[PDB]
Design a protein around this motif. Structure first.
Motif, short mmCIF file in Angstrom:
data_model
loop_
_atom_site.label_atom_id
_atom_site.label_comp_id
_atom_site.label_asym_id
_atom_site.label_seq_id
_atom_site.Cartn_x
_atom_site.Cartn_y
_atom_site.Cartn_z
N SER A 6 0.82 -1.20 0.00
CA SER A 6 0.00 0.00 0.00
C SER A 6 0.86 1.25 0.00
O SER A 6 0.56 2.21 -0.71
CB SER A 6 -0.94 -0.01 1.21
OG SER A 6 -1.50 1.27 1.42
N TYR A 9 2.47 1.64 -3.37
CA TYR A 9 1.44 1.98 -4.35
C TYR A 9 1.03 3.44 -4.24
O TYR A 9 0.91 4.15 -5.24
CB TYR A 9 0.24 1.06 -4.17
CG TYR A 9 -0.71 1.01 -5.34
CD1 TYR A 9 -0.36 0.35 -6.51
CD2 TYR A 9 -1.96 1.60 -5.27
CE1 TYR A 9 -1.22 0.29 -7.59
CE2 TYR A 9 -2.83 1.55 -6.34
CZ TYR A 9 -2.46 0.90 -7.49
OH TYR A 9 -3.33 0.85 -8.56
N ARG A 21 4.92 -0.09 -14.53
CA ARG A 21 4.29 -0.18 -13.22
C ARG A 21 4.13 -1.63 -12.78
O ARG A 21 4.48 -1.99 -11.65
CB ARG A 21 2.93 0.53 -13.24
CG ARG A 21 2.05 0.25 -12.03
CD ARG A 21 0.78 1.08 -12.09
NE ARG A 21 -0.34 0.42 -11.43
CZ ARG A 21 -1.57 0.91 -11.38
NH1 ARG A 21 -1.88 2.07 -11.94
NH2 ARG A 21 -2.52 0.22 -10.75
N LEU A 25 5.93 -3.59 -9.70
CA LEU A 25 5.16 -4.39 -8.75
C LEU A 25 5.72 -5.80 -8.62
O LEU A 25 5.95 -6.28 -7.51
CB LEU A 25 3.68 -4.45 -9.15
CG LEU A 25 2.63 -3.48 -8.60
CD1 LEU A 25 2.49 -3.67 -7.10
CD2 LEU A 25 2.91 -2.03 -8.92
#
Length: 70
Positions: A6, A9, A21, A25
């Motif tokens: 989180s 992000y 992206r 990740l």
């Protein structure tokens, strides 16, 4: 695991195109696996922060259906 995902992000991924992206990740998920912290694969920040009421109240304000703008 979800709180570290989180944080990355909500901070890092503002100005990144979707392919890089997803690459970042999966790279950070690989590093999490190397350092052995329990994080899943199918986490979504909407599933943990954005409620359906606020989602509807913002979609009625002029927002589209794309997840990137969400």
């Amino acid at each position: 695991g979800n709180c570290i995902i989180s944080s990355i992000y909500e901070t890092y991924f503002g100005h990144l195109n979707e392919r890089e992206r997803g690459d970042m990740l999966v790279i950070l998920k690989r590093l999490l696996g190397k350092f052995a912290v329990k994080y899943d694969v199918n986490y979504r920040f909407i599933d943990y922060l954005v409620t359906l009421d606020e989602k509807m109240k913002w979609l009625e304000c002029g927002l589209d259906k794309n997840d990137y703008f969400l």
